UniProtKB/Swiss-Prot annotation:
EC number: 3.2.1.17
Protein name per its UniProtKB record: Lysozyme C
Expression across tissues: In the egg white and polymorphonuclear leukocytes.
Active site: 35, 52
Major subcellular site: secreted
Keyword Secreted in record: yes
Pfam families per record: Lys
UniProt GO MF annotations: beta-N-acetylglucosaminidase activity; identical protein binding; lysozyme activity
């Protein structure tokens, strides 16, 4: 599913991501924009052989099981395929664990490089929320 910008903002808020660990909704929408362009089915293979999955490009080295990332963990206790669903519940619950892991949203290199320090509220501007 490719979400609309405000549609995704609403779904994220519905699932309790708004201001989670102090990160405003615009931060999460911005991260999703640059990680997946709002496409739940996004996947990307990393140099280390792990894969990133879903709207927030969650990585199989630590967070989910895909059966093909040697030496990895599955800390969210989910198949990576669950992160590709039109229903963002699994991605949101896993993101909550990731952002609580110590480095906040810096876990998403794209957030650090493209969202951090910017006017992230622009991402939810105009949205009925
Ligand atoms: Cl915001
Ligand atoms: Cl594996
Ligand atoms: Cl980047």
């Amino acid at each position: 599913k490719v979400f609309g910008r405000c549609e995704l903002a609403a779904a994220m808020k519905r699932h309790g991501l708004d201001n989670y660990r102090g990160y405003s909704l615009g931060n999460w929408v911005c991260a999703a924009k640059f990680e997946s362009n709002f496409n739940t089915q996004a996947t990307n293979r990393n140099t280390d052989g792990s894969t990133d999955y879903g709207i927030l490009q969650i990585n199989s080295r630590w967070w989910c099981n895909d059966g093909r990332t040697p030496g990895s963990r599955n800390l969210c206790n989910i198949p990576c395929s669950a992160l590709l669903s039109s229903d963002i519940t699994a991605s949101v619950n896993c993101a909550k664990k990731i952002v609580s892991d110590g480095n906040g949203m810096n876990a998403w290199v794209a957030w650090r490089n493209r969202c951090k320090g910017t006017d992230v509220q622009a991402w939810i501007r105009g949205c009925r929320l």
